[PDB]
Each structure stands twice: as structure tokens, then as C-alpha cells.
Amino acid sequence: QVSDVGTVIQVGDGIARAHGLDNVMSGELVEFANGVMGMALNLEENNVGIVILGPYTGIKEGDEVRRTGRIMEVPVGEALIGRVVNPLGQPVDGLGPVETTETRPIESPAPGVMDRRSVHEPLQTGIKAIDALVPIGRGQRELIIGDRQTGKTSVAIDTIINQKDQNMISIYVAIGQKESTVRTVVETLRKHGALDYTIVVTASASQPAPLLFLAPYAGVAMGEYFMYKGKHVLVVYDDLSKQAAAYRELSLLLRRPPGREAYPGDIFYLHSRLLERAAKLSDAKGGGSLTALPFVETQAGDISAYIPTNVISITDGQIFLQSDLFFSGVRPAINAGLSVSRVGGAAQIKAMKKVAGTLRLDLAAYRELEAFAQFGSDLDKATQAKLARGARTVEVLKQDLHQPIPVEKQVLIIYALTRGFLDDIPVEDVRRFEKEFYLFLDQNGQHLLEHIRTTKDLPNEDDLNKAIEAFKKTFVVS
Amino acid sequence: MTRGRVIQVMGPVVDVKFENGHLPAIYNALKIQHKARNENEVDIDLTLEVALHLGDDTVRTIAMASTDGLIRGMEVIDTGAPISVPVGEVTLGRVFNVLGEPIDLEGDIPADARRDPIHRPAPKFEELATEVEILETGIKVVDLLAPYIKGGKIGLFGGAGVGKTVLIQELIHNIAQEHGGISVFAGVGERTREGNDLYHEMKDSGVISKTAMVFGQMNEPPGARMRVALTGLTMAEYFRDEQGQDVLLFIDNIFRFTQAGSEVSALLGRMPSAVGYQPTLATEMGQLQERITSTAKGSITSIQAIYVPADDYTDPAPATTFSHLDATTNLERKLAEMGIYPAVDPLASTSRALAPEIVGEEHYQVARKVQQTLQRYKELQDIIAILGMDELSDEDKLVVHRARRIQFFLSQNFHVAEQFTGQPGSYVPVKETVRGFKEILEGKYDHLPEDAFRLVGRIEEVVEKAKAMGV
Amino acid sequence: MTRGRVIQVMGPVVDVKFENGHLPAIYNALKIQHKARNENEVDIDLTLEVALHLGDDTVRTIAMASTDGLIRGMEVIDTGAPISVPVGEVTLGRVFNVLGEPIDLEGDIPADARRDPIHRPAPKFEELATEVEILETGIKVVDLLAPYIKGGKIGLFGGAGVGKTVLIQELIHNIAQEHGGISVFAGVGERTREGNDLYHEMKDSGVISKTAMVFGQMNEPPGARMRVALTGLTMAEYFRDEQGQDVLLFIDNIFRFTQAGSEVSALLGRMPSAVGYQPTLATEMGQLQERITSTAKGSITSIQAIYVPADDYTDPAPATTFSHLDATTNLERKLAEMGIYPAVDPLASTSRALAPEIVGEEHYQVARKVQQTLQRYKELQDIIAILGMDELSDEDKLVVHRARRIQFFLSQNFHVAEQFTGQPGSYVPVKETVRGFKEILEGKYDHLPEDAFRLVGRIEEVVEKAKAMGV
Ligand SMILES: Nc1ncnc2c1ncn2[C@@H]1O[C@H](COP(=O)(O)OP(=O)(O)OP(=O)(O)O)[C@@H](O)[C@H]1O
Ligand SMILES: Nc1ncnc2c1ncn2[C@@H]1O[C@H](COP(=O)(O)OP(=O)(O)OP(=O)(O)O)[C@@H](O)[C@H]1O
Ligand SMILES: Nc1ncnc2c1ncn2[C@@H]1O[C@H](COP(=O)(O)OP(=O)(O)O)[C@@H](O)[C@H]1O
Ligand SMILES: [Mg+2]
Ligand SMILES: [Mg+2]
Ligand SMILES: [Mg+2]
């Protein structure tokens, strides 16, 4: 046997300082002669600043560490489907330990620039507002930010659940999420039946800051193996604010110099590695695809903070949620004004590109004119028709919880004339109008939406104008 | 048989150097016993806890007392076991300090009683409760807007002088007497006279029979203000584990626990974050809050009144403890000033109990409509302040006219409020709360004076109040 | 020439030791090429950049790749010269990284291609040019409000608004079509998807055969993003000082350059300052931007989009770049608040070219008229907000008549990304656009709908599309 054995000197705050290790290689895994793991990060001149992975109560001074030379790896494989695992791989719900032996390095090079493609495959989110106004491709990096309990986790749940009829694998990484809430989310996922493809990785608050830091990297590393296989993978984060907080705490413990607001310097070089390992791979490396939805918290939508400023410049699109609108009755509180998408158009089907190209303009015009008319006295009545139409089309862009609406049923409702038909009692009709319309189509005019499913484009509008007329006649006025 | 000598003394932080290799483990209670060897010394029986190992056989500790009279060269005694607390049914009705020694003048627990070290890991995955049921209290606002989940966590954020302690005491009055299980109150970092004002009051009432009380108050050193919460929490975890009874849990001010780190960790050598709080703030708060969970063996309903310094919710201490509570209510000083109690914020306070699938579709409708009206009323204050009142549309003339009624009907009088003013309290049902909010919503009582809705309970009280007043 | 030893590693910062006598200077390129001794090791290929001399025959360096895998005691090879990049007619069409390695994947550059140092002082005042040549960009807004001085420096600093990337992408094509000069596009921190899209667009259009680019992966350690743009500047320096043919250059961002440099400069730096930024940010940015200057021999004209965090221009990092730009397009929200895009602020954007004796007063008269008619809207918009009735208490009549309608005639459609929007369009010169400007100022088409003046190419296109669109 050959090895290089160290000596632990200082222990505290989940940090261990080791001396010796003439053959120490940076970033390797090391054990502390107590069955616990550890990582080496700050290879100072005459000592190694080791970072403790897990409980550190049993470690004292004088313990000797054993080198392993193993770059920090995580097991991957097909048996992970339906499993909830610690970032090291061990499951938390019993069920026996992990089975697949294939492993990958947590820190791995990102796919090359020459190996990517113009992302031209839509994603069927199923939520009306995000579907119509802020599209998502199959390799895009959409960002979701907002205040507490504005529905970000609900958006993630709806997005993961709606993948019931596609070739997608969804990976959940709950950083800093409370364990009871993670259990509730797992129960909801099992109750809706999405465990047939979901890989969920959790890291409780009680877990050490090193694990809270390494969890998203473990999730993306697990995703990459399925990526190179040729599949499509969806990865959803939680509380990258808490991830950054954990890394800041670790850096302050290792006595690194602090930058602005105590965050260390390499935060951006960290987030770039975390995020830019998702893209679309051409045939040269396999026709894979992977998209991510990192989450960020904020106070009242205040984007002046350092972490949101570092994050928004990376993601290809930003989705804003505001409690101000959310309490106002827009339950999916997508603020359509400040939400952008750098893949707009190419991520929408040949029907949505036709129908929704004017809805965003109409909503922006409605808000533009109602800003002038925040008070409704002695207004110029000539422009009031567009205000009315915007008010009665914004009502359409909302749906209840656990309600994934298919794109085929959505496109008829958001048709460029369906924004401008009768609307006889639009203040209260439209809500039941859309449900009775979906039932009407599914019981009478299923062929109409069958054409949309088969073609990804509008049929002749008269062929559906007849259906619209028949549904208006049959449906009872309000 | 290991001995050490004190080396470096810095405030409430004390260093000890031990023999090579024979150091005590982390989190082991270290006892300092001494007798005055001359006129110029003081007897000291004082306890420490192991904090860090800082090289060359040194141990850096924290103290649970004033550290007054320590002399460089005093001998150190190691017990080798963490700070232990007497545990079991023996402690029912008793009062303890942070160290686990009674103070209620009822002698002392026998020295051979069962006891358990405080620190321990958190529960695993398989033993976490998934179902959600509603525990109701009787106060209109918390009953309707944000119900309290039994077996979850409830936090009461508030400023200084807004009434978190009053809300806690009234919740005790509403719940404790009508439950029938183990109860635990662990005062931490609160006004010390509350100890008497609560102990004798509970003794007079009678619920003292099957309760546990732990008192670590403000005057006590930072080590005590740290570990008192852990002591009480272990005392409650024993009953949630071994007997399976339903256990209640109160914490007067858990903010002090995380604040005492801001006082200690500076001496321990860590650089601070942007605000003076310790860099480990997240870890300590998480590892404390994780021990309060529901398991298959029982149920814990914990109410934790978090204080917010400077009324700043961008402060890390409140801004990072939001994720650990399933239900909460925020107390607004501005609403408190203008004569509304308990001044619960109706738009900022939320919870995950509020769902149509649980409280009922009509209940959810009422809550959503109330939130809509209050949101619009809050938004229109700029217009009201800048360019008058009657410049609104005709509709807003009624939306404001109803929101002003609603924010006062949310008021109430409490049984505790019988001591500030002679007017007694009331007890309200959720069904009648819902019905009253409805009848206000469709404008049945818009003719009544707007300011007559203050300080009522169920809708019949405001009806008879409008009757009794000549106007 | 002797070799060196690695001592300590922190993040991307790596230290190197050396013997006396053969100590390398600052900015020297240090290369490491080892092989795995046994199973516990991993092969490594990486290069370093010298920063400081700490004494004791030691030197602090930084990395150009991932540092995972560095082990104490490695042999360090000294080259003795700064990083060198191939120049000449070899690089036309290739795709290089920060080191000069062609990732274009066709082949590898011959070992005797002319390689020149990256770092050197900028050309001196002794011969700097002064002639003012105006470039017809073919876009009405840029030609009118602030036309570009071909030879100086132009900066679409947009306050980090969304809408720059597309503008640079369009400018590449149309300017290259205008003048088939040598073009270079360099990205200091890139959305890899956007970089690949640009590469594919250029290869499809064919202009790639007469251009050369360097791409910096934003995931690379901050050394690459610190020292990438100097590669493009060096190639432009060669093509200016070797053939005299005038070259045009692009820069995707400069704020990300400053940030990437700042992180390492603070990690190993003396002390922080400003808002946590570098101490030497001004000098670091000045040494870079001051190299892009028109000279006696030839001219270099550059377009640089500048990121501004939180839309606050008081940020020192962009605030110090103003002195280095002769034409600023302060986009800000760039009318993304309206449906309009990517219009540049119609009054705030300024340049040197606004002068009757520089542009010829035939265009200055029209610029005067457009400025006067279009500036008065926002100057009285805050008043007409309250006075938004049909009243005429304000003599804002013709301004409300014209402003929005003619602002709609401030967007071009000739080569938009039809994949992103779908609208067609046709090219337009300012020489014939001044006729449409005179026509609209005299008000020939004040009877046409406002939507008919929006998203149009030329004045004839506006009138014909308006006559066809709903007559
Ligand atoms: N669009 C919606 N429709 C119905 N209920 C909603 C909607 N959005 C949020 N809710 C409800 O409001 C609460 C929001 O909690 P949730 O955790 O889902 O949101 P969040 O913004 O992701 O919060 P967190 O701060 O925990 O990340 C839940 O009770 C949820 O059921
Ligand atoms: N429900 C209520 N009914 C009537 N008065 C109330 C109510 N809640 C609070 N008050 C008034 O506000 C005061 C708040 O007292 P309390 O001791 O609870 O303050 P606090 O905000 O909890 O602060 P602290 O715990 O720091 O003393 C009460 O003494 C009383 O005057
Ligand atoms: N010239 C344009 N025409 C139409 N839409 C545009 C234009 N420029 C930007 N946009 C809008 O913004 C998106 C692209 O923004 P982009 O220029 O990539 O932002 P950034 O420069 O911040 O990266 C488009 O998909 C569209 O929604
Ligand atoms: Mg959530
Ligand atoms: Mg109080
Ligand atoms: Mg860009």
C-alpha cells in the first residue's frame, strides 16, 4: 500500500486544517479516519485547508486523514429514476442504497461552443401566461425570481408535472428547502404520478454548508450523463440565494478576503460553471438537450441586489413574479412587462407564432393607457375600446393550481380573433367560457384540435369559425 | 483523569490548554470549581462548553456565567459529557435555568435521575409527517386569513412595542386549557418579570399541572441565551419521542438565540458578514429549527415569536428564517399606532394552510376578495394623499368605503386585553367570521358608520353596537 | 534558463517559486505541462500569467483554465515573453481562444507563424490622427441623432438594457456590406448560444471568410476574460500597421471584462475600494481602450456595448469609460417600455458629429427640426398625464400630433432577424432619407394612422404600406 497521510490540527465550524500531505492534489476527496468525507480547497504553503462533508462532531485534533486521489464524483445511472438521494448518492427514504456504478466528476468541462445549435424545439409548459408571452426552448436557461410565497415553487411543480406525454426527464435540486416541505413536494409528485421519471436531490437546512453548496453541482452532473445518452433533461433549482449564502459562509470560514457585501470574488466564476453546462447538443455529440430553471428570491422584486445582478446577466430569459399583482387576482403573477426571452418566436409553434404575436403588444398597450388612466374621470373615450379589450384579455391569462392546459386547447383561446370575438359579458363570462369551450371541443369538435396537434399550425379559420359560432350558440349567456 | 489550566480570557470567552492527545471532544461541559485561597479571591463554580480546537493542544471554550474572577493558572476539570438536562416526567411543573438545575425553591431533583445530553442530530426522512390539519384558535384574523397548521410551525414576526407577547399569551389562553397534552414554554431573551407574571398566573389558572417551563432571561450571559432554547427543545423532544403524547411548544423570542452569536462569534475569531451577524448564522438557525418537526410518533405545534430589530425585514436574521415556517403573521407598527389590534398585517401575512381544497371554496373566495379590496385600497393611498378623495371613479368610492370597514372589523378585544382596559374579551367561531366577512362584502352594512366596526367580535356585536350608539 | 516550483493554490490564484538569476518579469507567460506519475494523479495542461514579485524568489500568478488537479512541487517552465498570438493572413476566418489556440477545428496553426506579444504600450501622441470622416451606417436613427465617426470609437453603452446583441449583429452585416474592410468581433464573456448563433450567421452570410474572431467562454477562469480582448486589439494592430488597410472592430462587452478582472484583482489584490471594485480599475481600462485609436498610418473603429448594473449610471466601471467614446447611444430602456425597439434615447444620446461644419448644415437643419418637434413630448408628458383629458389648457397640440407618430418612424426593417420577428424590410440611405425627413417635418402625411408609420423601411414604403393597410 502507498498513501500520504495527513494530520488534523484545527477543527471548527465544519472546517479542518490538516498539515503534511506531500502528495496532496487540489480538489480531491479525503476521509478523516472516522468514516466521514472531506474536500481540499485552500492548498496553502505548509497546510491544507480541508472542508468537512457531513457531521464534524467526532473529529478532534490529532486525527490523521488518508489520501484517496479521487476527484469528487457522484454516481449516476438509470436506477436513479424515481429516487430521492443525498448529493453523495445515498438515498434518504430507505429503499436500499443506489445501484448503478457509473460515475462522473462533479467539476467537468462544459460542452464546446462548436457543438451547440440554434434551439428550435418548443417546450410544452402548459401554463397559459408563460406559454403565450415568454417562450422556452429545449436548451434555454430561463430565470425565475420574486418574493416569498409568490408561487415560484408552484410554477416549478406545474412545469415538472405537465411533462406527462413527452421524452423528458426532470431533475429537482432543492437547495436549502425545509425537509418537511420537501416531503410534502415528494408526496404531491407521487400523488400526481411523476415519479416515473423524476430524480430529486435534496439538501436540508441541517445539512452542512459544503453539501448545500455542492448539491446543484451534483444535480447537474447527474443530468449530464443522461444528456450524453441522447435524451432531454430538465433541471430545476431552488434558492440559489441560499446557495450563494452557503458559499459565502464557507469562504468567510476559510479566511478568504471578502468582496462586496461579504460575498467572495469567485461567485460569478462559480455561477457561470453552474449554469453554462446546459445547451442543445448537435448530432456531433448526440442530439441531446437540457434546460434549467434556476430560482432566486428577492424583496418586493428589488433587483438591485448583488446576487440577482450577477444572475440576470447570465440567463437567456427572466420571469418576474410580484406579490403586488399576485394578491390582486393574477394567480400566475407573471409580470409581462419586465419578463423577456431571448429565444422569442423560434420557441413557439407555427400556430402560436401566428396568434400570440399581438397579445403582448395588446397587454403592453393596455398597461400603457391605464397608467395614464389610473383614474377614470373625464377620459378620452376614443381610446377606451383598446383599454376595454386589454382588460378583458388579461383576464384570460390565469389558471388555477395543478391545472396544466395543453397548447392545443390554449391556442384556440389565444387566437388573434379569440382575443376579439363577442365577449358579451367578459367580466365574468370568460372564466367558465373557456372551460365549457374545452369540454365543447372535446365532446363535439375534437377533430378541430386534432388538426392542430397533427399540424402545429392553424387550420382554415372558417372551419373553426363554424365551431366558434356553434359553441357561442350552445353556451348559455351570463 | 485529565486536567488543564486556563490561558487566555477574553470577556465571556475562555481558553483552556489540555494535555497532549487527551483533549475533550467538542460540546463537552467543562466545570471550574475553586475555593477562595485568600482574602483577594472569590469562590467560583462555573461551567463551560467546548467550541473550537485551535492548534497546539489548545481548546477555546464559551462560558455559561459572568467569567468574573477567573485567574490565569486556575485548574480545569473535564466532565467529558455535554451539557445535560434532567429529562422525563419529573420536570413537569418545574422551572430550570440553561444548565438544567431547578430554581422554583422546591428543593432539587434527585442526583440519580435520568438525563440526556442536549446536542444531537436531526431526524431522517422516513419519519416526517405529510398530512395537514387545521388547528384553530378563536381570533378572526388568524382563523380566516392564515390558519395555523397543527404539527407544523407558526412564527409571529413583530417589532418592539407591537404586541407579540400579548398574542402569545392570548394564544396560550385559547389553546392550552383545551388540549389535554404535554405543554412546554421555553422563555428565551425576554423581559425577565414575564417569568413571574406567567408562572404565578398559570399556577392560579391550573394548567401549570402538566407543563414544563425553562427560563433563560436577558441578564444571563450569551452562552445561556444560546443554549436555553436547546435545553427546552430537548425537553420537548423527549416527550415527542418516548411517550407519544401531543406536545405544545412556545418560544418567547428566538431572535435572541441567533443574536447572541453576533456577540460571541466575534471573540471566537470569525470575520463578520455584511451585517454584524456571524458567518454561520444560516447553519445554527437551520440546525435549531430542524429539530422542530412532526414525526410518526407524535405532533409538535410550535409558536415562535421572532423579533425584528429596527423593523427591517431586509435584516438577515428575519430575511433568512422565513423558509422555516409553514404559517406566519406579520405585526405592523403603523397599523398598531392608528388604533387596531392585534394589528395583524392582512396582505403580508400568508400561510400554506390557506387553500380552497381544505378551508372550503367559499372560504377561499372570501379570503381572495378581502385581499383584493385591501390591495387596491393600499395602492390608492398615493392618489388619496396627493389629489383628494372624490377624484376617484364611482366604483372606488365604494371599494375604499368597504376596505375601511373591513380593516376595522378585523379588530377584536382579548381576554388578556381585560387588564389594559376594563372591557372584557370574546371568543369567535370561524363559520361566523366567514359569514360576517361575506355580509360586509356584498355591502349589507355599508350604511352603518365606518368607524363603528372597531373593537368587536362576531357580527352580532357590531350590530348591537350600532344599535346601542345613538348614531 | 532554469525551471520553477509551485507552492500554494487559492481558487484560480496560483503561486510559483523560482531560483535566483532566472526570475521572470511581470506579464510573462508561464506554462505547465506535466504527466500523471501514478493512479492517484490526473494529467494537467495549463498556462499561467505572472502578476507580482513577493520576494524570496517567489512570484504570484493566475490561471487560464480550471485549476483542479494542481499538486505541490510541479515543474514550471518559463517562456520569457508575454502571451503571443498568431497574426497575418493566416487568421482570416478562424476562431481563437484567449491563448491563441484555434478551436476552429480545421487544423492547428503552423509553429512558425508570426507571433506577436499581447501586452505593449499604446501608440504615443507624436503622430495621432485628427481627421473626422463620417460613416453612412444606413440606419436613420444612428445617422441622424448621432452619426458615427469612422476611425474614432463608437459605444452603444446601453446601461445594460436588453436589445444590444441584436443591434451589433445587424451592424456587422450592414456595415461590412457597406465597406468590405477587415472586421474583428471579440466577446469578453459570452452567452455560448449567442456566440454560436453569430458564428453560424457569419458563416452562412459569407463574411466570415474576411474576418477573424476570438471567443471567451464565460465559464473560463477570470484570467481568460481578463486577457481576451487584447487579442482582438493585437490582431487589429497588426492589420493596421502591416498593410495599411483600414480595419473595423467589435466588442460585445466591457463591464464583464472589468468584473472578471476585478474578482481576481481583489482576491490577490492589495485592498478593495469603490463599491468593492478594483483599486486600479481606471488604469486597467484606460490601458485597454487607449490602444484603440486612429493613427497616422491607419484607422481602427470599434463598437462596444457596455453593461450597467441595476440601470444606474453612477457605477464607476462604466462611468470611467465615457472619456473613451466619441459617440454614445444611451439606450437605457431604449423604449422597450413602449413597443418600440431598439430606439436610442432621442435626446440624451450625443456625439461629436453634431456640428454644422462637421456634417454640413443641410443635415443639421433637419436635425434641428426633428430635435425640436420630438423633445417636447416628455418635457410636457408629466403634465399631460394629469391633463390627459380632451382639454387644451396646454399648447402641446402639434407635439402630441407628431411625437408618437414620428417616433414610430424611428425603426428599420431591412435585415431584421425574420426568425425573431418575421417582418421584411429594405435598405435606406440617409442621403435619400433626408427627403422623407423634410416631408414629415412639413407634415404631408399627418392624416395617416399612427400604426402605419411604425415598423417601416423608407418614406415610399410608409406611404404605400399606409395606403394598403386599411386605406
Ligand atoms: N397561481 C396560484 N394558484 C393557486 N395557488 C397559488 C398560486 N400561486 C401560489 N399559490 C399558493 O400560495 C402559496 C405560495 O406558496 P409556494 O411555496 O407555492 O410559493 P413560492 O413563491 O414558490 O414560495 P417559497 O417562498 O416557499 O419559494 C401556496 O399556498 C400556494 O398553494
Ligand atoms: N390585542 C391587543 N389588544 C389590546 N391592546 C393590545 C393588543 N396587542 C397589543 N396591545 C397593546 O400594545 C402593547 C404591546 O405590549 P407587549 O408587551 O406585547 O409588546 P411587544 O410588541 O410584544 O414587545 P416586547 O415583547 O418587546 O415588550 C400592550 O401592552 C397593549 O397596550
Ligand atoms: N431589433 C429588435 N427587433 C425586435 N425585437 C427586438 C429587437 N431587439 C431586441 N428585441 C427584443 O429583445 C429580444 C432580444 O434581446 P437582446 O438584444 O438579445 O438583449 P441583450 O442585448 O440584453 O442580450 C428579442 O427576442 C425581442 O423580444
Ligand atoms: Mg414556494
Ligand atoms: Mg411585548
Ligand atoms: Mg448580449
TrEMBL record, chain A:
Residues 126-341 form the ATPase F1/V1/A1 complex alpha/beta subunit nucleotide-binding domain. ATP binds at residues 146-153. GO terms for cellular component: plasma membrane; proton-transporting ATP synthase complex. ATP 1 binds at residues 148-154, 177, 331, 399-400. It is found in: Cell membrane; Membrane. The record marks 339 as: Required for activity. Residues 2-69 form the ATPase F1/V1/A1 complex alpha/beta subunit N-terminal domain. It is a peripheral membrane protein. ATP 6 binds at residue 342. It is an enzyme of class 7 (translocase). The keyword Nucleotide-binding applies. ATP 5 binds at residues 341-342. ATP 2 binds at residues 149-151, 399. Its EC number is 7.1.2.2. Mg(2+) 2 binds at residues 153, 238. InterPro entries: ATP_synth_asu-like_sf, ATP_synth_asu_C, ATP_synth_asu_C_sf, ATP_synth_F1_a_nt-bd_dom, ATP_synth_F1_asu, ATPase_a/bsu_AS, ATPase_F1/V1/A1_a/bsu_N, ATPase_F1/V1/A1_a/bsu_N_sf. It catalyses: ATP + H2O + 4 H(+)(in) = ADP + phosphate + 5 H(+)(out). ADP 2 binds at residue 342. ATP 3 binds at residues 149, 152-154. Produces ATP from ADP in the presence of a proton gradient across the membrane. The alpha chain is a regulatory subunit. PANTHER family: ATP SYNTHASE SUBUNIT ALPHA, MITOCHONDRIAL (PTHR48082). This is ATP synthase subunit alpha. It comes from Bacillus sp. (strain PS3).
TrEMBL record, chains B, C:
InterPro entries: AAA+_ATPase, ATP-synt_VA_C, ATP_synth_F1_bsu, ATPase_a/bsu_AS, ATPase_alpha/beta_chains, ATPase_F1/V1/A1_a/bsu_N, ATPase_F1/V1/A1_a/bsu_N_sf, ATPase_F1/V1/A1_a/bsu_nucl-bd. Its main location: membrane. One of its GO terms (molecular function) is ATP binding. CDD domains: ATP-synt_F1_beta_C (cd18110), ATP-synt_F1_beta_N (cd18115), F1-ATPase_beta_CD (cd01133). Its EC number is 7.1.2.2. ATP binds at residues 158-165, 352. ADP binds at residues 161-166, 341. It catalyses: 4 Na(+)(in) + ATP + H2O = 4 Na(+)(out) + ADP + phosphate + H(+); ATP + H2O + 4 H(+)(in) = ADP + phosphate + 5 H(+)(out). Keywords: ATP synthesis, ATP-binding, Cell membrane, CF(1), Hydrogen ion transport, Ion transport, Membrane, Metal-binding, Nucleotide-binding, Translocase, Transport. It comes from the Bacteria. Mg(2+) 1 binds at residue 165. It is a peripheral membrane protein. It is an enzyme of class 7 (translocase). One of its GO terms (cellular component) is proton-transporting ATP synthase complex. Mg(2+) 2 binds at residues 165, 194. It is found in: Cell membrane. Pfam families: ATP-synt_ab (PF00006), ATP-synt_ab_N (PF02874), ATP-synt_VA_C (PF22919). Residues 150-335 form the AAA+ ATPase domain. HAMAP family: ATP_synth_beta_bact. Belongs to the ATPase alpha/beta chains family. Produces ATP from ADP in the presence of a proton gradient across the membrane. The catalytic sites are hosted primarily by the beta subunits. This is ATP synthase subunit beta. The gene is uncD.
